[PDB]
């Protein structure tokens, strides 16, 4: 399963 939201990678 993949979370619909997370901190954008940067």
């Amino acid at each position, epitope marked *: *399963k*993949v*979370a*619909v*939201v*997370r*901190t954008p990678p940067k």
Partner: antibody
Amino acid sequence: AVTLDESGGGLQTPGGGLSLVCKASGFTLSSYQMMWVRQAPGKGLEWVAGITSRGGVTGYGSAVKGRATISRDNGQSTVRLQLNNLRAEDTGTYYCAKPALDSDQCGFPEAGCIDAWGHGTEVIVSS
Amino acid sequence: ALTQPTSVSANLGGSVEITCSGSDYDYGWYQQKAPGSAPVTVIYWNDKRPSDIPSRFSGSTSGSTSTLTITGVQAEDEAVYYCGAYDGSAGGGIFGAGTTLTVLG
């Protein structure tokens, strides 16, 4: 083993502000995205706010948008909900809620992924 | 918004089904025996049952509709069941209005 313990409720000032704290125990808080849910007297559950594992992204329900601030302190194992410009419509029980899966799998607004609920804290908005 | 029926009735020892629609994402089912009391998750992520929940509780999402099934209803199952899911259009969490289960007899 998992416990979510809310505090900061009680009688609150209309137009004023409140600060709710969820103290999490029995799991590593930093491995999870977290959310707050509320229930007004004689009403159903309503999604309030959510936060990613390191506080990088926040989200709010339409009823509190622009008046709410969700934050977390992984080091202290706490999630905090601030709400201002309090109104009668904010009266209810506020619950801290934990997703069943880790931050990679369940996001903060995935209200279908909840496995643990706090005991809840009562908020009364009245002068 | 999520759509679930206001009420449902089941006979003791029988079966009951509760549907929930309105999300294209994963559904959860939360039991509440009294308002203001902490809900109890019976089903999360469509069909997963938490360790402390009896086998009689099952979940099934087919298409974009979830069905909560209780096979072999007991008197303690009488509660309000709320469905929860992600709102793909608006971006936050959403809940259904709740389904009241009455155990007949």
